[PDB]
Amino acid sequence: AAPARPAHPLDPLSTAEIKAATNTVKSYFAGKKISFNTVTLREPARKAYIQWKEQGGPLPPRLAYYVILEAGKPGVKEGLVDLASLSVIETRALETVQPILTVEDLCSTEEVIRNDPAVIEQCVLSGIPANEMHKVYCDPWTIGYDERWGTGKRLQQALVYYRSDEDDSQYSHPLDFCPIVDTEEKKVIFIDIPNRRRKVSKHKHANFYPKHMIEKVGAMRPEAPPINVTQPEGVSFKMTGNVMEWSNFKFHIGFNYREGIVLSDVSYNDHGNVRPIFHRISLSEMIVPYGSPEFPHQRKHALDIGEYGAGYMTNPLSLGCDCKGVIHYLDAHFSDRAGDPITVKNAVCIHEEDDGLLFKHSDFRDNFATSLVTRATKLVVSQIFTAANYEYCLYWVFMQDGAIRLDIRLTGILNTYILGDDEEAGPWGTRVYPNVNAHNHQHLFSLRIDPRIDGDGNSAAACDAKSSPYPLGSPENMYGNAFYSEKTTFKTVKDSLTNYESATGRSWDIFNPNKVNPYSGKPPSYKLVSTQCPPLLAKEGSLVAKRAPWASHSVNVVPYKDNRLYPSGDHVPQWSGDGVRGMREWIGDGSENIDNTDILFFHTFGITHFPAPEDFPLMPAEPITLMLRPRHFFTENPGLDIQPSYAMTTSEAKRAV
Amino acid sequence: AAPARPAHPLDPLSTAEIKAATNTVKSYFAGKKISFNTVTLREPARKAYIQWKEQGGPLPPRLAYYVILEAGKPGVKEGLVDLASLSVIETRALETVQPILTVEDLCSTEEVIRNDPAVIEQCVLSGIPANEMHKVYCDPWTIGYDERWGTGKRLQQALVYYRSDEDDSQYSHPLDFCPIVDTEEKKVIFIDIPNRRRKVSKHKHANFYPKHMIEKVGAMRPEAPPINVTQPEGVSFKMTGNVMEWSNFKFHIGFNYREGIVLSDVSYNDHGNVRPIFHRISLSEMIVPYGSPEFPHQRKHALDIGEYGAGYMTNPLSLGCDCKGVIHYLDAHFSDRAGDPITVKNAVCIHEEDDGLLFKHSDFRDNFATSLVTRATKLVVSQIFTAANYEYCLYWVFMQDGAIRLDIRLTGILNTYILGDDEEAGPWGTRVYPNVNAHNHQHLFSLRIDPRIDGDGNSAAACDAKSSPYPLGSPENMYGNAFYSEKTTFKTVKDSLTNYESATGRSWDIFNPNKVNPYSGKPPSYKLVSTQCPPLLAKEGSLVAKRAPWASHSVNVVPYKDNRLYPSGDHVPQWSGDGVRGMREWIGDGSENIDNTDILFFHTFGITHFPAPEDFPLMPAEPITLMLRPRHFFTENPGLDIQPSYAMTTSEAKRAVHRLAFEGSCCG
Numbered sequence A: 001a002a003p004a005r006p007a008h009p010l011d012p013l014s015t016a017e018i019k020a021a022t023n024t025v026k027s028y029f030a031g032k033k034i035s036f037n038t039v040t041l042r043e044p045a046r047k048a049y050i051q052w053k054e055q056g057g058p059l060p061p062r063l064a065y066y067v068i069l070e071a072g073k074p075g076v077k078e079g080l081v082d083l084a085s086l087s088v089i090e091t092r093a094l095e096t097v098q099p100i101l102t103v104e105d106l107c108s109t110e111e112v113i114r115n116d117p118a119v120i121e122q123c124v125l126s127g128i129p130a131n132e133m134h135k136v137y138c139d140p141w142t143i144g145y146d147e148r149w150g151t152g153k154r155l156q157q158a159l160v161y162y163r164s165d166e167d168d169s170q171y172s173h174p175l176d177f178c179p180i181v182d183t184e185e186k187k188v189i190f191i192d193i194p195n196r197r198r199k200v201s202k203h204k205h206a207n208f209y210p211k212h213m214i215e216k217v218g219a220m221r222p223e224a225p226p227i228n229v230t231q232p233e234g235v236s237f238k239m240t241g242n243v244m245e246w247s248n249f250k251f252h253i254g255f256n257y258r259e260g261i262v263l264s265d266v267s268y269n270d271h272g273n274v275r276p277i278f279h280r281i282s283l284s285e286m287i288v289p290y291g292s293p294e295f296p297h298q299r300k301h302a303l304d305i306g307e308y309g310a311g312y313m314t315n316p317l318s319l320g321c322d323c324k325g326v327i328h329y330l331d332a333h334f335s336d337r338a339g340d341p342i343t344v345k346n347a348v349c350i351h352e353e354d355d356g357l358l359f360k361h362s363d364f365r366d367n368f369a370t371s372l373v374t375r376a377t378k379l380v381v382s383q384i385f386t387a388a389n390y391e392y393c394l395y396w397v398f399m400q401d402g403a404i405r406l407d408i409r410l411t412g413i414l415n416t417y418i419l420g421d422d423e424e425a426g427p428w429g430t431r432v433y434p435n436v437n438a439h440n441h442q443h444l445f446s447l448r449i450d451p452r453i454d455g456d457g458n459s460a461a462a463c464d465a466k467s468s469p470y471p472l473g474s475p476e477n478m479y480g481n482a483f484y485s486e487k488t489t490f491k492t493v494k495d496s497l498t499n500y501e502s503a504t505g506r507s508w509d510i511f512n513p514n515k516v517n518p519y520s521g522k523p524p525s526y527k528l529v530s531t532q533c534p535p536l537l538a539k540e541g542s543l544v545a546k547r548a549p550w551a552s553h554s555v556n557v558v559p560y561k562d563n564r565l566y567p568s569g570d571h572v573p574q575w576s577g578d579g580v581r582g583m584r585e586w587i588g589d590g591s592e593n594i595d596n597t598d599i600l601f602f603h604t605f606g607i608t609h610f611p612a613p614e615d616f617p618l619m620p621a622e623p624i625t626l627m628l629r630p631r632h633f634f635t636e637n638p639g640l641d642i643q644p645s646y647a648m649t650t651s652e653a654k655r656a657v
Numbered sequence B: 001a002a003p004a005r006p007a008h009p010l011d012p013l014s015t016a017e018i019k020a021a022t023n024t025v026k027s028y029f030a031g032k033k034i035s036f037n038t039v040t041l042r043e044p045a046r047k048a049y050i051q052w053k054e055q056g057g058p059l060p061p062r063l064a065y066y067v068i069l070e071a072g073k074p075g076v077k078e079g080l081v082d083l084a085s086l087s088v089i090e091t092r093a094l095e096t097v098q099p100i101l102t103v104e105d106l107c108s109t110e111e112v113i114r115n116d117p118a119v120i121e122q123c124v125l126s127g128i129p130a131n132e133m134h135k136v137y138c139d140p141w142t143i144g145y146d147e148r149w150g151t152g153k154r155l156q157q158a159l160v161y162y163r164s165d166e167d168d169s170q171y172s173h174p175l176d177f178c179p180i181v182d183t184e185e186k187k188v189i190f191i192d193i194p195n196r197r198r199k200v201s202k203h204k205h206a207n208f209y210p211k212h213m214i215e216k217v218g219a220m221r222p223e224a225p226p227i228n229v230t231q232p233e234g235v236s237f238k239m240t241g242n243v244m245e246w247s248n249f250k251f252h253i254g255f256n257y258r259e260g261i262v263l264s265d266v267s268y269n270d271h272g273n274v275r276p277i278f279h280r281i282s283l284s285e286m287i288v289p290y291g292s293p294e295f296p297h298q299r300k301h302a303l304d305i306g307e308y309g310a311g312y313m314t315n316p317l318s319l320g321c322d323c324k325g326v327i328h329y330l331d332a333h334f335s336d337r338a339g340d341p342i343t344v345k346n347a348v349c350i351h352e353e354d355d356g357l358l359f360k361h362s363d364f365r366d367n368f369a370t371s372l373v374t375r376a377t378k379l380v381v382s383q384i385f386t387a388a389n390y391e392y393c394l395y396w397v398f399m400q401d402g403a404i405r406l407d408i409r410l411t412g413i414l415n416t417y418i419l420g421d422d423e424e425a426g427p428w429g430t431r432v433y434p435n436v437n438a439h440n441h442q443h444l445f446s447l448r449i450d451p452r453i454d455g456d457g458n459s460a461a462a463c464d465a466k467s468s469p470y471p472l473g474s475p476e477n478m479y480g481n482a483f484y485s486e487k488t489t490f491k492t493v494k495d496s497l498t499n500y501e502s503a504t505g506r507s508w509d510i511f512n513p514n515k516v517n518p519y520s521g522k523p524p525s526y527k528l529v530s531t532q533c534p535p536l537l538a539k540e541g542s543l544v545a546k547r548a549p550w551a552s553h554s555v556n557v558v559p560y561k562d563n564r565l566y567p568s569g570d571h572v573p574q575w576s577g578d579g580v581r582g583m584r585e586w587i588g589d590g591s592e593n594i595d596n597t598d599i600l601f602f603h604t605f606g607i608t609h610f611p612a613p614e615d616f617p618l619m620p621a622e623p624i625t626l627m628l629r630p631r632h633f634f635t636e637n638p639g640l641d642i643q644p645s646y647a648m649t650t651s652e653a654k655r656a657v658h659r660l661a662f663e664g665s666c667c668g
């Protein structure tokens, strides 16, 4: 009764595999009341995968990682199931952590608060009658961290809002108080109540559907005439299960509950020479730290990936109108609390689109009659997830010059808190609507790159543009114009801990010091070009800085070890930030070698958001991007064998008298 | 008889107006042998324009600015023609400047150097026999600045290359020497010859047409399947002559020989309140400073806009497709040296296209059945110009959230110089192909904004993200998470001279201190969000820093005066960089007021390029972008009245499918 093996060792667990895993765990815990928090692929060891792929090695065993809760027991148990033998092969109890909050965990909280007498009383005081609790809503957040309870109970905090009508957007009407909910007992254990009470706003809700806009401004704009994009002869990409082949790239598209999209085993076919570039690339953690110091707002610093899961939160893309053209979809499969497989249909959208000019050059000599123009196509692998108020639109983009870009668009709704009639929002927030305070915050992301640049044994470096040190008027720099790129190769982990610097236009290289470009004499590399790299604004030693040790630097590079995925640790909710785990453990004392070995490159990037009224009641998409581009990887522009859209040589131009 | 007036005072000169202007100038200089360097609109004074537009004032007079050379006179003469009276109304002689190099000025240089005995001898020494001079090519550059001649002669430098076959890309085969050419005498006056001779490369040319690639790698890829764009019901924008209306924006699209595209009189129609945003926005200058200190490479720091002209260099866009989709084109008109109008067809392309999601939100409570999503459309006004080896693709982009973006793509070919067999290219350059040294260089641009944010009387500020100054554990900042935006309003010119700073994620506001957003309490602004802001790497006091005094800071804000367009001065070629002109003049002693007045905001942005083999023999497009976004300008998202691509309310979702006194979440 063992489940069928996948097409490919990195494929996510099938529904049959998930059911097999949960059957096995229920049997192992026979007679105990357990509930499933996470059931997900435990990916093969890096060595095992690579030997299977390239050296005729054995197929790695199919393993399931699980996290469960047991009625009446603190914390969690976790372990591994060997799927071929239907057996639990590793197990341990962690009594003092709390795990990722699932959709089921969060879907239960509104009923809890609506029926709680102490919450009802606070609504009455706040100007909402006791019989109108159906109009009170909350966004159920991780408590994040609260030093009154630590990890001793599993807790949520309910950010409470009011709707006059169920079709309203509730965010114009936050209430003043914050219930704390025991997730497993399903009760309110405390309510944070501010010293200055602010009753519910009496303003109209700030709404945004067409029927609302017609009331607000009189009419919708006329429907614009259509801009139709078609691919009547299909696409150039080919999928074989989860394996993508496009413009010489080949890679595996994976997906899990936490990271969402995971791109693996990325190679480029350089005229028959298939060259590895990356073993794995994904987003591994986030943190969205808010900037109001007033209590209890310090508890808004969601680590969305580790506390809710970019997979668990992902939107089905069918009706989303962001997968246009001829597309390919992938589903995602998770477990529910009962241990049954659940599906998100069309979680991943794959499509190719026009990306402007790839390159062009014309000769002035014959008035540009000698000319070659080639248009670019990009391949886009995307998902969109919803983290209560916000939407994160993630686009992994492959390009025909061999570069890879991550484009993010942020949209959805500002998180809001109540503002008194006479209360000033600034300097920690903006009054984006009457009685609405949209607090300042950052959105920060931890990109995790496991490189294999042109094969094994890699290094990383900071690259800084510098004027020559010789002064103007010296024999060395007579006219003062000389400049160069200073490359600082990181020898130990400590050397790698570095920030973006505008003063040198810093970039970072990930390179293979065992190989040399036969033209330039430099090692083959991919260069990270990324300028949206905010400093972490929370202080050293703050709750934010402690729980996200990775976020303090733009770049952290540590040795590879299997299962080094998550840089705020494996179980993130309610960790105080004290202890050696995640990135803090990997960095250690900073002395380990990272030159010419198997490395892991974690990049912090994102934005700092000071809200303005343009962002409300629904925010226009805000862009974030970074690129990984080949430098000294190829010996020439690798797109030159793409047929031009137009080409005329000099001889041809002359012939056209 | 006088030429017909244009539809609009900001319209570029027509071919009839160009001919009228040059007729008028020829008559004024009766019996003299003159040649036309520039004939272009002299735009109306800002105040006059605005009085005309808004206050019932008179039509500004239609004026043509000209620059001419006269045989046997040094420098230039320039002046103004009043087109309605066909008379020269202002005139002056500038004996000690040199003007923009036109296509005709440049076109004869290659034949000059091919036929020069001293150049032929250097080719022979370099391994190219005299009977192969037809294989020798050069890119004709301005000399930039050479302290041996100043502006006393009008000079070009010829960067020399060799083609084995006319269809080669010549850039794999630079020669080692640099002829200096007198533009008006058409003769070689000097040749810079290096101490270390490097004879011509014996390698195959590094070529890139399909026939070349088939020989190099065996075959081309299969033709990929088409991606087609159609608009079967037409476009959403409306043009009335050069006036554009699209998604509540209205503005004038102008074009000239120098700046290329110029966007004027930009307003947004905010539900009946027509609100000004910018009076004028354009690129006003560039500089592309190379980073090898070895002679004569210091002379590679082209100021492409002021020395050749983004209009004069611009490609006809009919034949790519350069520009894809359903297109409205504009032509450009200039004068040639004889004073006749010339036309560049399809200089400017205008089109709208999909630009991803504009916004989306879904409610988890019913598993995202409650959802709204609206796709974005952008309007693009673009040109592409070729500066010898490089191509600059410029895209002015208007967005439906009210933002305006400038996107640039750089492509074309690296500038290359010869590298000896045993010679190291580094640290000033890269060996991108055998015997080829592609030197380091920056590409820097000066964006000129003449703002009119929600009307008249504007200011500018730097905005810096800062942690609270109170320490972790204080009553003010208990958990150490507090942070805010520090706004520093520029009071005087000197205050404005500011750089991008990664440490604070610096942005800049241009705002109207006379007005206030009734929700946020802040003035209406457009915020410049721009991170591709390199430091100028050339030292203080270098030739580069002196000729481009604007490039030293990311932001320069000076008082408005009429005719403050060009920050490296009006006549750029061969200016040493000494003297009080351009940005140096406008900054003055730094003391002038720029708070709540008419200001001009010059932004330096661009990239630092360290070449790699991927860039050769033809470079993949490298992007640069900056954005100007409304912040506190509107009181809510201005795109919300656009029809959603999909919408379902909670009540609709419930109908679609037909603890605890009160129920919890639908999904519970």
Ligand SMILES: [Cu+]
Pocket: A441, A442, A443, A609
């Ligand atoms: Cu935000």
Ligand SMILES: [Cu+]
Pocket: B441, B442, B443, B609
């Ligand atoms: Cu460049």
